[PDB]
C-alpha cells in the first residue's frame, strides 16, 4: 500500500480524578496530519501539517462536531465494558480503535481495517471480507451480535471502500507542494 490513511482513537479512562481523556490522531501514509484532544482548554480538530493548515474552515467544524459525538459514544462504551466483563467501577481503562484504508498505485482499496482493543488486548476486528466480524472473547461476542443486528458492518464497509479512499485521494492532493 503506497498510500494509507489511518486514525488512532484513544479513550483512556480515569474513574476518579475526572473524565476519560479522549483523543483522535490521523496519519496520511505515516505522517501525522490532524489531531484532537479532550484535555485541551478549548478542544478543536487541529492540523499538524502545512497542507492541512489551508483546509476549508467549515471542515474543522464538521470534524469537531463528529469527534465530540464519538467522545460521548466512547464514554458510554467504557461503562458498558465494565458491565460486559463484570469489572469494578473504579479502575482505569483504555479503548484503542485504529481505522484506516491503504490504497495501491491504481487508486482502489487494497485493504481496509478497524481494530478495537481494550486495555492492550484485542477485542474485535472487521474481517478481510469487510462483511463479517471476528470477536476475541465472550463479551466481544455480545458486541458482535449488536453490530450484526444493527447493520454496522455495511456502514463501516461503506466508510472504508468509499469515504476513506475519496478523502485520502483528496488529502494527497492537498499534501503535494503547491
Amino acid at each position: 500500500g503506497p498510500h494509507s490513511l489511518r486514525y488512532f482513537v484513544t479513550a483512556v479512562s480515569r474513574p476518579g480524578l475526572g473524565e476519560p481523556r479522549y483523543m483522535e490522531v490521523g496519519y496520511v501514509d505515516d505522517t501525522e496530519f490532524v489531531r484532537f484532544d479532550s484535555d485541551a482548554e478549548n478542544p478543536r480538530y487541529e492540523p499538524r501539517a502545512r497542507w492541512m493548515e489551508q483546509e476549508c474552515p467549515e471542515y474543522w467544524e464538521r470534524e469537531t462536531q463528529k469527534a465530540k459525538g464519538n467522545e460521548q459514544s466512547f464514554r458510554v462504551d467504557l461503562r458498558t465494558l465494565l458491565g460486559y466483563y463484570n469489572q469494578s467501577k473504579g479502575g482505569s481503562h483504555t479503548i484503542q480503535v485504529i481505522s484506516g484504508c491503504e490504497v495501491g498505485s491504481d487508486g482502489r482499496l487494497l485493504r481496509g481495517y478497524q481494530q478495537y482493543a481494550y486495555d492492550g488486548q484485542d477485542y474485535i476486528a472487521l474481517n478481510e471480507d469487510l462483511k463479517t466480524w471476528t470477536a476475541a472473547d465472550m463479551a466481544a461476542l455480545i458486541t458482535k451480535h449488536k453490530w450484526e443486528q444493527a447493520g454496522e458492518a455495511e456502514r463501516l464497509r461503506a466508510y472504508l471502500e468509499g469515504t476513506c479512499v475519496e478523502w485520502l485521494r483528496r488529502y494527497l492532493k492537498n499534501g503535494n507542494a503547491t
Binding site: 449488536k146 443486528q149 444493527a150 447493520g151 454496522e152 455495511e154 456502514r155 464497509r157 461503506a158 466508510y159 471502500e161 468509499g162 469515504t163
Partner: protein, 237 residues
C-alpha cells in the same frame, strides 16, 4: 407492525426522476437507506437520526433524502441512469446501534426507452409421456418469455391453491435479447396425481410494468402491471 416501503416496483426512463418513500416503525427514530445492486451485495447509503443526517456513504449527489415530522423519510432520485437500476431497502432501528428492521424494498429499473417494456408470454407444456411411464413422476414445465424488464414473479396454483412444495423456478431470468427476457419453471407432480383429470394446474406470472401516471403512445396497449397465466388440466392415459 412492520416497516412500510412504497412503491414496490417502478420503471423509469433514463434521465427521469421518482421518489422512494419509507414509513418506519412507530416510535423509531433511526432510519437508514441501503441499496442492493443486481449482483449480490449490500451498499450503505444514508443514515438519518431524529430528522438529521448522521452518517453518509455511497449516496450520489443526485439522490437526496430527508426525514419529516412523522419520522417517515423519502428519497428523491433525479437524473436517473441505467446503473441506478437496483433494489433499495429501508431499515429503521429505534436508536442508533439498536436492532434495525428492514422493509420490503423498492425494485427500481431504469430503462433506456419506455417503449421496450412489454408483458410476458406464458405457456406451460404437459409432462412427457415417456418420463411418466418410466418414473411415475410428472414434471410440468412453464415458459414465460418475451418480457422486459425483469419484474416477474412466477407462482404455481394447483386446485386454486398456491403451492411451494415441488416447484423449482429458475433462480434468475435469462436475457434472450437486449430488450426481452425469459423465465422457466418446472413443477414436479406424481403420475397418479397428474393422471387424475380433476386436478387443475395453473402457472401464473406476475408482471410489474408501467404505471398509470407514465404516458403511453397509442397504437398498442399500455404494458401496465398485470399477471398472466397458462392453465392446463390433468390428463389420463
Amino acid at each position: 407492525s412492520g416497516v412500510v416501503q412504497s412503491p414496490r416496483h417502478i420503471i423509469k426512463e433514463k434521465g427521469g426522476r421518482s421518489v422512494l418513500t419509507c414509513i418506519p416503525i412507530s416510535g423509531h427514530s433511526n432510519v437508514v437507506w441501503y441499496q442492493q445492486t443486481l449482483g449480490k451485495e449490500l451498499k450503505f447509503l444514508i443514515q438519518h437520526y431524529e430528522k438529521v443526517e448522521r452518517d453518509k456513504g455511497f449516496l450520489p449527489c443526485r439522490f437526496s433524502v430527508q426525514q419529516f415530522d412523522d419520522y417517515h423519510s423519502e428519497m428523491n432520485m433525479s437524473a436517473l441512469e441505467l446503473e441506478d437500476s437496483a433494489m433499495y431497502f429501508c431499515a429503521s432501528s429505534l436508536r442508533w446501534g439498536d436492532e434495525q428492521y428492514f422493509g420490503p424494498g423498492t425494485r427500481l429499473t431504469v430503462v433506456e426507452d419506455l417503449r421496450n417494456v412489454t408483458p410476458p408470454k406464458v405457456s406451460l407444456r404437459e409432462p412427457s409421456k415417456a418420463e411418466i411411464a418410466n418414473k411415475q413422476k410428472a414434471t410440468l414445465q412453464c415458459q414465460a418469455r418475451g418480457f422486459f424488464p425483469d419484474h416477474v414473479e412466477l407462482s404455481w396454483w394447483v386446485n386454486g391453491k398456491e403451492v411451494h412444495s415441488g416447484v423449482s423456478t429458475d433462480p434468475q431470468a435469462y436475457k434472450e435479447s437486449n430488450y426481452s427476457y425469459s423465465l422457466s419453471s418446472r413443477l414436479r407432480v406424481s403420475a397418479t396425481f397428474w393422471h387424475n383429470p380433476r386436478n387443475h394446474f395453473r402457472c401464473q406470472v406476475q408482471f410489474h410494468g408501467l404505471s398509470e401516471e407514465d404516458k403511453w403512445p397509442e397504437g398498442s396497449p399500455k404494458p401496465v402491471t398485470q399477471n398472466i397465466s397458462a392453465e392446463a388440466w390433468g390428463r389420463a392415459d
